Amino acid sequence: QHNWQVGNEYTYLVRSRTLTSLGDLSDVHTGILIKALLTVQAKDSNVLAAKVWNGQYARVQQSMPDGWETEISDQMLELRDLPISGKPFQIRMKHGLIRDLIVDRDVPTWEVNILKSIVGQLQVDTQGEDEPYASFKAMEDSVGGKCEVLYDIAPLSDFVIHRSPELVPMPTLKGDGRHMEVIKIKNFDNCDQRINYHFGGKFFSRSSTSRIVISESLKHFTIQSSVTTSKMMVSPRLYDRQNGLVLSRMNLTLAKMEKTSKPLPMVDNPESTGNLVYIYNNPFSDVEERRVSKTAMNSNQISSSEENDFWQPKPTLEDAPQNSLLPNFVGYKGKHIGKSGKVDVINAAKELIFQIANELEDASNIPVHATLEKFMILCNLMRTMNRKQISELESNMQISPNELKPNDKSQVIKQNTWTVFRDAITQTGTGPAFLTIKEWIERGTTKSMEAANIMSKLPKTVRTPTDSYIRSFFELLQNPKVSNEQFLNTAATLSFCEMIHNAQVNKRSIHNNYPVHTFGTSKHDNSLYDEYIPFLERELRKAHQEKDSPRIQTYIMALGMIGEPKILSVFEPYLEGKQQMTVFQRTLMVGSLGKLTETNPKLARSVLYKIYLNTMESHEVRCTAVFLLMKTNPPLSMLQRMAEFTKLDTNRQVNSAVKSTIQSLMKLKSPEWKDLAKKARSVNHLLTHHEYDYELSRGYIDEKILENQNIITHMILNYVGSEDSVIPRILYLTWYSSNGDIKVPSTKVLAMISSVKSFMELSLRSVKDRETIISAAEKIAEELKIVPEELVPLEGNLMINNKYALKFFPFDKHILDKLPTLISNYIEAVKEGKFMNVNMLDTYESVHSFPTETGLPFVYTFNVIKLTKTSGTVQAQINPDFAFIVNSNLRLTFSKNVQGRVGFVTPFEHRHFISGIDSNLHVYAPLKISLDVNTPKGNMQWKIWPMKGEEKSRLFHYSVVPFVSNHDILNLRPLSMEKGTRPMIPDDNTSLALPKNEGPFRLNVETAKTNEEMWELIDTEKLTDRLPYPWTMDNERYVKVDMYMNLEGEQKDPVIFSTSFDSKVMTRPDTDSENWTPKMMAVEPTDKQANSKTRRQEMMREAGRGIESAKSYVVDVRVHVPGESESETVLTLAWSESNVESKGRLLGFWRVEMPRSNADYEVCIGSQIMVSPETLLSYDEKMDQKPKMDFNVDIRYGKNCGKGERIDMNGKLRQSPRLKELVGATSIIKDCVEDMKRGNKILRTCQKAVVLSMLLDEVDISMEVPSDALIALYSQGLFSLSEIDNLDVSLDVSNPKNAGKKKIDVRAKLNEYLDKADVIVNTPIMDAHFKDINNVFYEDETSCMLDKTRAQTFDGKDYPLRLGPCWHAVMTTYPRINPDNHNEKLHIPKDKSVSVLSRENEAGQKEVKVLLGSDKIKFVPGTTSQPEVFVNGEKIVVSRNKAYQKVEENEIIFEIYKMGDRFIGLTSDKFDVSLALDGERVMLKASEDYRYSVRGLCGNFDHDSTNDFVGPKNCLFRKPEHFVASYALISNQCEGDSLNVAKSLQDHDCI
Ligand SMILES: *[C@@H]1O[C@H](CO)[C@@H](O[C@@H]2O[C@H](CO)[C@@H](O[C@@H]3O[C@H](CO[C@H]4O[C@H](CO)[C@@H](O)[C@H](O)[C@@H]4O)[C@@H](O)[C@H](O[C@H]4O[C@H](CO)[C@@H](O)[C@H](O)[C@@H]4O)[C@@H]3O)[C@H](O)[C@H]2NC(C)=O)[C@H](O)[C@H]1NC(C)=O
């Protein structure tokens, strides 16, 4: 392995280059070139003498059409002098490859790195780990690190040498050997020592190649050339096509080969620099110091605490952190930026803060001043300060917000100064910053909201979480000024837990999100467990003792968020049952186990499964367990057992949850859920056929893959159904999107509530209306001795988590109690006037760095800055009649700036070369608002003004600009104003002024002549069709837009927006039933003004005539826009409905006026829908009486509504005889055929069967279109519909279906069984033929049947039945417990007092008594073809053409009417109940409001068919006879039988 023969003198010419460019977008290239000479002398066997002298360099920024390898002549260059400390250093050889270098006192570490690169360019391996061929792999080292390389050796032909003689300058050493070539390829995925700074495969495509020429092998090596080439491909904005390039090269070539003349001087100050990898330094020491590690391992022969590699020391809480790669830390010759003295750190920060504060008042010019970039520069600058400097700056600012006036208008700049300084301190993320925050809070400069907002942003800003940092944070957490308050305390504890988790709990978080390589939580530091877990344990126990809900929620969430298995031992005395706990707290504890599944999936899966198995637990807990269980990748056996259990499980909610979650894992196709898709598909054949509604628990996973950009976007949404109301209780929402190995952080939401009904009742209590009137309902409840259920406390959560902040808001009863007081206080606060100034500034950061192959740092950044600003005076005046008058003078602004940059930094010149793209968004709202709301009259009048002094201000600005830059690091200014920055305006650029006429708005869009996408989307108002089509809009190319306001000559004419509302009940002669003509006509009102009572009355009258007991509604809207061309607008709607007969009508009226252009347009609509068969319950299998459904739609429009294009659209439906055959040959038909033979009347099964019996198959839609343009539009729509995947392709036939007649008919057959439909389309222009619950009458799952010998409950229970002579209570409402006092009871609400009393006649008939608040009704059966109807002890007649109404204050109390063969009805609108009887059977219909608030024979109405046998004493029953006996009044007309049974039941023991 002999090489570098002793006594000889060599000489190698040195060339190298490093360039940064923007890839395919342009050809400009920014970078430097280097020239030098290297002389090596063979001093002895193992020590060589070297020297690098004659250093020159030049900087280049020019177009390179040929490529980055183009030779540039020295005449075209601008050579400089390289600050190289040319001294006779030395190099030593160790049995082959080079081992270590020697440097003198003139040791700037960057110079040593460059020398290391030059040395390592000579690295060769003649042997492995004649024979011209050879190949193997070696674990070699270089400047970048010790990554492995692949070798390849082969001789080089003479033709190549003859063609290109440069590879072999002087060939006279062929001798007995020849010339070879070596190719080395290095991969970076397997290394030993690495240098990097990562914060925030990973879109980092690296490469390395070499080429060395040789002489006679293994005995006379004689290196003669060496070329290394490296690339780095990176995406700028994390969603791009890799246009970011950083390229490098190093060149060596032999020049001289001759005898030594004079030995080089010996180095007098040995400074061993170790191996060839990059080495850090100290950025603050006045005397140069380096951290070089010399392992000196014997080797030979064939994280853990070890020396490993040299790392920078961990900084303290007072000293600044030490980094050796960022521009600010090693810009000035490897030292900190302020060491130069040309910049003073404190003064620069002061000027930056003053500029930012001053420019933040004139918000319309934020984009042109680059304020947000200035904020980022200030944050970077303050990342280098120490504690004394920030303290001195705070003293020098002469600012203290405590002395400031919060609502003053004079000290706007001072308040802005405080705000910007506070935001910068929050975003700095260093030890001194946290010390400053501790000093602020401890002495009391930020009391509650500011402090909590500050600590909500800490967990996602801190750079290096050290041990002493966390210890100080804990010491602050143990301060009385933080614990006693609530919102600050919860924010601080959550931030503590999150930072602990990130810093130590997850090793992946340590390795990825933090720069471990540049800085080396020790394993021996077991302080976490002992110091922290007992703290949270003890304080959670104390909070549980005190019975304080927000504290319990906060501390459970924190202990869950720490994410370690010890939380299981923490919780096991809680979940098991040793400590009492509410359902809300239990579900929060179960949901808190989310972080444990992502770290130790198996143990969390076991715990969640064990929770799931139990059935006696609450359904919300089980549901949440299911959702957490199927995010763990279970095996096939688990899911098989899941599906098997689905069928046999009684709980509807859990079944719905598991079925939905299993079924939702199917449409996915992506390499992260792929392994579970097959298992999901292998389960359907075990699932239950029953399909559940939407009010129950469900799951949904969404996928959106874009193979063009390799973008994966997800969404998870879960909810647990509520047992009291429609609105679900719990909600989850996650938007994690990953494209590669690095992804944007996840966004999560979690909302929870104990009970929706209780929450609404407490929130709406601010009405000052406590019920006092007592009706018969409370007497009924008291005599039955009804005890209400034990009330549950109200609790709630709301958590938001995203890139910026982590927030948490635990609810309580006390907070909702305090809400009205704060509302009132704010009400008199805004009585006269109140100024405000609110600013939010949050940012996101990510920096990645690693040395290049030329010996220079490479830094990549990605910043986004978000601003939200409000300012103005708001005044309100509230009156007891709700005369809510508000005047506001606000200004609104929103801006965003995202910028990604790639490049490198050269320490010896303090310069920075960058290529990247940045974008700006900006919106401004200088508006005045006047709001007058008068709620008794339904008026909602707005007035909007253009704010004075903002006649011509920017309203919109979007600009995307790519650039290349070459800027000094000492200067602290935005790069847009630097001289070296060059934008890349495309060659073919044209401007554009969108408004062709001088309208109120101006738009100025400029871009390249190409980009036809935006060039058509933006300005082309002609092709305004299929224009939006949300796409990416090629955001990687130059664009800039701006929209001003052209309003000049300040105007006092408001833009108004009015609204109204009304209702009425139609009087006697209008509903004469002779006014219903089969076809309607649109009505033209006599009055066409805005918000007119006459039009409302006319429409309401014409909408309800001919319908018995019909209610008409109306909604009137007005919009007014003044200016050079006024635009009035009138819109009215009307509709009718009645509970007696299915006969509804709709009407509309639209009209806009243009007083300047004299343009008037109108449209009138009149429609009706009727279903021919009257509502009926029983099967009535005799005869058919086939169902019918006809409707009419009529429109008319033009300058005058009456005279103009009128469309007469008529429709009709039908049921085919094939469905007669199917119904006559179906299961349910025979089922209740046998039942009616037995005598069953209103059972559930054939209620569903008659529901099917009232089904419609054929559809006959016809429309007469007098406009050919409408026909053409319909033809275009038909072609578009035929373009769909499922729709068959049908074209225009030679013979049109119809000629001279305008009509399109569509019909779907019945034999398809609604699996798919066939739709025929017959237009005069095109003919198309396609290839292959519902309407219900007075029946739903809600109702409760009460038949002669059967009983169907609210929730679906059946049991034997037999009544008696004395009254029984069917449906009742009972009073509850006062939330304020656990002794007093509240009263029945005025609009929810109902009692229903039944009876069995001695002759088999039935009697009905209903207590409707303060009224009573009795239904004597009789034998007069209808049960006798007495109202309040007075007789009323019910006939075919009359009906009973009780009307008060234009509201309906109850309706009595005759229907069917022997049926009469009672539907209470004010009470939301319905009843029907025939003297032999009664069925009861309720509303959703009565959930968990009724008790009687029907049941408790809880969507549960298991616990509907509960008595007044809240005791479950076990025999229908026992239940019927129990729920029986014993007042009068009763003796024995039921009385004896009730006496025995009282004597006996229930359950
Ligand atoms: C690592 O570093 C070394 C050191 O520079 C590089 O080696 C150089 O390689 C270039 C390759 O282009 C050499 O340039 C060549 O020089 C030849 C000799 O130059 C004499 O003759 C020309 C007239 O032809 C005179 O103008 C000049 O002053 C000299 O007197 C030229 O003949 C070559 O011409 C090429 O282009 C013409 C175009 O028509 C062709 O016809 C030719 O056939 C030929 O291809 C060429 O210009 C340069 O001399 C080398 N320097 C040396 C040997 O010291 C390595 O390239 C570099 N490694 C890299 C870049 O990977």
PDB file of C-alpha atoms in Angstrom, residues 151-220:
ATOM      1  CA  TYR A 151     -15.984   1.184  -5.073  1.00  0.00           C
ATOM      2  CA  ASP A 152     -15.251   0.147  -8.653  1.00  0.00           C
ATOM      3  CA  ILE A 153     -11.821  -0.227 -10.266  1.00  0.00           C
ATOM      4  CA  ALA A 154     -10.993  -0.787 -13.938  1.00  0.00           C
ATOM      5  CA  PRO A 155      -8.249   0.286 -16.361  1.00  0.00           C
ATOM      6  CA  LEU A 156      -8.872   3.261 -18.625  1.00  0.00           C
ATOM      7  CA  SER A 157      -8.388   2.874 -22.371  1.00  0.00           C
ATOM      8  CA  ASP A 158      -5.846   4.907 -24.327  1.00  0.00           C
ATOM      9  CA  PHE A 159      -8.538   6.290 -26.651  1.00  0.00           C
ATOM     10  CA  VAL A 160     -10.073   8.258 -23.772  1.00  0.00           C
ATOM     11  CA  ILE A 161      -6.659   9.676 -22.851  1.00  0.00           C
ATOM     12  CA  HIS A 162      -5.988  10.683 -26.457  1.00  0.00           C
ATOM     13  CA  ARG A 163      -9.406  12.330 -26.782  1.00  0.00           C
ATOM     14  CA  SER A 164      -9.262  14.226 -23.463  1.00  0.00           C
ATOM     15  CA  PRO A 165      -5.650  14.651 -22.292  1.00  0.00           C
ATOM     16  CA  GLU A 166      -6.609  16.588 -19.147  1.00  0.00           C
ATOM     17  CA  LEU A 167      -7.290  13.410 -17.157  1.00  0.00           C
ATOM     18  CA  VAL A 168      -3.625  12.437 -17.626  1.00  0.00           C
ATOM     19  CA  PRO A 169      -1.513  15.636 -17.641  1.00  0.00           C
ATOM     20  CA  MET A 170       1.893  13.960 -17.363  1.00  0.00           C
ATOM     21  CA  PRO A 171       1.914  10.219 -18.195  1.00  0.00           C
ATOM     22  CA  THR A 172       5.587   9.283 -17.718  1.00  0.00           C
ATOM     23  CA  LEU A 173       4.875   6.986 -14.727  1.00  0.00           C
ATOM     24  CA  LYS A 174       3.128   4.139 -16.549  1.00  0.00           C
ATOM     25  CA  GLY A 175       6.243   2.018 -16.034  1.00  0.00           C
ATOM     26  CA  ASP A 176       5.371  -1.666 -15.928  1.00  0.00           C
ATOM     27  CA  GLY A 177       1.792  -0.807 -14.921  1.00  0.00           C
ATOM     28  CA  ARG A 178      -0.936   1.270 -16.529  1.00  0.00           C
ATOM     29  CA  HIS A 179      -3.601   3.887 -15.783  1.00  0.00           C
ATOM     30  CA  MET A 180      -6.816   2.947 -13.976  1.00  0.00           C
ATOM     31  CA  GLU A 181      -9.978   4.741 -12.880  1.00  0.00           C
ATOM     32  CA  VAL A 182     -11.999   4.493  -9.665  1.00  0.00           C
ATOM     33  CA  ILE A 183     -15.675   5.414  -9.334  1.00  0.00           C
ATOM     34  CA  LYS A 184     -17.052   5.904  -5.825  1.00  0.00           C
ATOM     35  CA  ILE A 185     -20.770   6.310  -5.119  1.00  0.00           C
ATOM     36  CA  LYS A 186     -21.845   7.255  -1.595  1.00  0.00           C
ATOM     37  CA  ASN A 187     -25.280   6.797  -0.050  1.00  0.00           C
ATOM     38  CA  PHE A 188     -26.438   8.889   2.901  1.00  0.00           C
ATOM     39  CA  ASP A 189     -28.989   6.554   4.518  1.00  0.00           C
ATOM     40  CA  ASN A 190     -26.387   4.629   6.559  1.00  0.00           C
ATOM     41  CA  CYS A 191     -23.752   6.708   8.355  1.00  0.00           C
ATOM     42  CA  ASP A 192     -21.927   6.938  11.684  1.00  0.00           C
ATOM     43  CA  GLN A 193     -21.023  10.596  12.343  1.00  0.00           C
ATOM     44  CA  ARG A 194     -23.324  13.290  10.972  1.00  0.00           C
ATOM     45  CA  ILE A 195     -23.566  17.073  11.237  1.00  0.00           C
ATOM     46  CA  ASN A 196     -27.026  18.632  11.043  1.00  0.00           C
ATOM     47  CA  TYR A 197     -29.452  21.112  12.622  1.00  0.00           C
ATOM     48  CA  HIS A 198     -33.034  19.891  12.177  1.00  0.00           C
ATOM     49  CA  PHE A 199     -36.010  21.652  13.755  1.00  0.00           C
ATOM     50  CA  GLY A 200     -39.694  21.572  12.866  1.00  0.00           C
ATOM     51  CA  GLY A 201     -36.729  10.641   2.041  1.00  0.00           C
ATOM     52  CA  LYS A 202     -37.733  13.945   3.654  1.00  0.00           C
ATOM     53  CA  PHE A 203     -37.588  15.501   0.150  1.00  0.00           C
ATOM     54  CA  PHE A 204     -33.784  15.569   0.505  1.00  0.00           C
ATOM     55  CA  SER A 205     -32.310  13.860  -2.563  1.00  0.00           C
ATOM     56  CA  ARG A 206     -28.545  13.752  -2.014  1.00  0.00           C
ATOM     57  CA  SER A 207     -25.833  12.185  -4.153  1.00  0.00           C
ATOM     58  CA  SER A 208     -22.061  11.849  -4.377  1.00  0.00           C
ATOM     59  CA  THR A 209     -19.774  10.634  -7.164  1.00  0.00           C
ATOM     60  CA  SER A 210     -16.008  10.546  -7.644  1.00  0.00           C
ATOM     61  CA  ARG A 211     -13.427   9.786 -10.324  1.00  0.00           C
ATOM     62  CA  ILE A 212      -9.696   9.253  -9.706  1.00  0.00           C
ATOM     63  CA  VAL A 213      -6.925   8.285 -12.155  1.00  0.00           C
ATOM     64  CA  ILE A 214      -4.081   6.045 -11.027  1.00  0.00           C
ATOM     65  CA  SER A 215      -0.749   4.441 -11.987  1.00  0.00           C
ATOM     66  CA  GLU A 216       0.768   0.960 -11.420  1.00  0.00           C
ATOM     67  CA  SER A 217      -1.463  -0.505  -8.745  1.00  0.00           C
ATOM     68  CA  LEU A 218      -0.569  -1.376  -5.143  1.00  0.00           C
ATOM     69  CA  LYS A 219       3.089  -0.378  -5.557  1.00  0.00           C
ATOM     70  CA  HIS A 220       3.117   3.092  -7.203  1.00  0.00           C
TER      71      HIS A 220
END
